[PDB]
């Protein structure tokens, strides 16, 4: 297929205008450009580019391009700095995967505040003034605001405004374990939304069609919707404005941003012709005008042409909200985010869950990787703690039962109260591990005077994780954890025997000031944790015997033992004591 350009774009786009750009490229270069609009484009591309064929260039929403790239279906693109400067800077952050540019940004789309200019000549700038506005409109038989509450796309702008986010983004990559749906900002935003329903300014049942019908018949002063909705309003007799979404706590609302994007098939022999067509023909005022004249593109990523389009203040408003918004992450973990958050908002809004519990459950289900690593650690710490108590003889050998785990032998207590105390401890730690807030977990051995004799220190690092690749990572990790168990089960040969009558406790060192974690760690009723006293932790003259260190993609960990010479603020400890031996 060398010497031609085959382009796939979706049939709702201006593909006849794109074909006209294709013909000016041909006149000037000889290269014939053929534009096609097949069906089910996004699902056909990973099927036919797996064979190595398909188009040289595919146009689609950017969000799918990050999985294309992890499948290696997209070429890396090499625009000069001077060409990048021609597009709005935030649009390049939507076409980056693993730090590398993988597509050209074309058009930008996001939600705006749409408002009826008979009811509301000046739209509110803050979410905070909508309750008072709705009371004034109710006395006129109207309401202030109606938008889809059934879909998290539409409610996210308010949730994300004060600190919520989907996946954390840095250096052109997403950390699939850093999710911001249950942080302080998300909860404030979802609290405000829920309080609007509580105070009867919105109805929790409102959906897309109910919101559109009501705004378009002059019954509600404002709605929140996208450029796909302008058409129906235009023929509705409502005169409407399109403006920036209100601030929340003085912060911009942050709608999800969609970027129409042009990617290059990694299998293509014409990669250089594709770069030239896209950079010097399409991404120009002349080329975008020809597409936009066929079917409007909305706001565009090329600055000079967007300055022309922005004479339509509707388009200016889309671009301004897009600049303040959150680029929709381009990774396959977004599908778990959407299900999780859709249930959270629906549940919280109809009063079927608390806000804290709705989001907490959404956080652990959107950040499935962070749940997986925390559960692997908690299973391991449980196994480790039992084995420590066996090999150091804190409890007699008759309460233990020989078992298999990580393919090495272990020892598991059958003492129900002991097991219950270790599970309570580890269930409280698990949410802190899910947030990567744990620096150290320390199994402490204490003598009859409640002074520390031994400390088994597990130092924990959880590296940022990208969209998972190695299919044997959990298997490789379990071999690394198995070696920790082997070190523990032969560690009596390196440690002096403990004086008789010892007990044990568990310490958590946190990364930051433990006072923020003081609420997150109280997960079990009647099993509180407190800030540790220096008597609880201070070791008199410690000797540091190292035991094991591992490194892997999901977890770096060091196990060492602090032993006292002669045996015979960021620290949390359970209030309760283990059942004595």
UniProtKB/Swiss-Prot annotation:
Q: What is this protein called?
A: Maltose/maltodextrin-binding periplasmic protein
User: Which Gene3D superfamilies did the record assign?
Assistant: Periplasmic binding protein-like II
Q: Matching InterPro entries, A to Z? A: Maltose/Cyclodextrin-bd, SBP, SBP_1_CS
This chain's source organism reads Escherichia coli (strain K12)
Q: NCBIfam families, per this entry? A: PRK09474.1
Subunit arrangement? The complex is composed of two ATP-binding proteins (MalK), two transmembrane proteins (MalG and MalF) and a solute-binding protein (MalE).
> Encoded by which gene?
malE
Q: Which keywords are on file for this protein?
A: Periplasm, Signal, Sugar transport, Transport
**What's an example of a GO molecular-function annotation for this chain?**
maltose binding
**Location of this chain's protein in the cell:** Periplasm
Q: What is its main location?
A: periplasm
**What Gene Ontology biological process does one annotation of this record name?**
detection of maltose stimulus
Q: Name one GO cellular component term.
A: membrane
UniProt similarity note: Belongs to the bacterial solute-binding protein 1 family.
Lineage summary? Bacteria, Pseudomonadati, Pseudomonadota, Gammaproteobacteria, Enterobacterales
Q: What does this protein do?
A: Part of the ABC transporter complex MalEFGK involved in maltose/maltodextrin import. Binds maltose and higher maltodextrins such as maltotriose.
What upregulates it?
A: Induced by maltose and the transcriptional regulator MalT. Permanently repressed by cold shock in a PNPase-dependent fashion.
